[PDB]
Design a protein around this ligand. Structure first.
Ligand SMILES: [Zn+2]
Ligand SMILES: [Zn+2]
Length: 115
């Protein structure tokens, strides 16, 4: 009755090492069965737009934020992590975490429409 991860999800979670600590916390909730998807969605909620992160950038301070939302923040001369306020620097290279994107697409098929 525990939520059962597919081989694909197990593979990608392993490969998503920038999020290692977070994934280990998230998988605590596999026991919660169908409700795991809910706690999963809450874990990858974006602090800026308050939706499941889309094209997430995983920051060096371990926070996932939509690339679009971090770009809005920088344009407003804020070079800080919106989740924890760690200074990222004006020159920060924003690289989407495509492993995490693919994971979210697997867990929530179709969620990214229109984003
Ligand atoms: Zn966002
Ligand atoms: Zn942060």
């Amino acid at each position: 009755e525990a939520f059962q991860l597919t081989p694909q999800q197990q593979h990608l979670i392993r490969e998503d090492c920038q999020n290692q600590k977070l994934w280990d916390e998230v998988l605590s909730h596999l026991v919660e069965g169908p409700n795991f998807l809910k706690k999963l969605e809450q874990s990858f909620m974006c602090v800026c737009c308050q939706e499941l992160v889309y094209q997430p950038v995983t920051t060096e301070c371990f926070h996932n934020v939509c690339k679009d939302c971090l770009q809005r923040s920088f344009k407003a001369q804020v070079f800080s992590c919106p989740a924890c306020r760690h200074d990222l620097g004006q020159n920060y290279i924003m690289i989407p975490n495509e492993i995490l994107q693919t994971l979210l697409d697997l867990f929530f098929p179709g969620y990214s429409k229109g984003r």
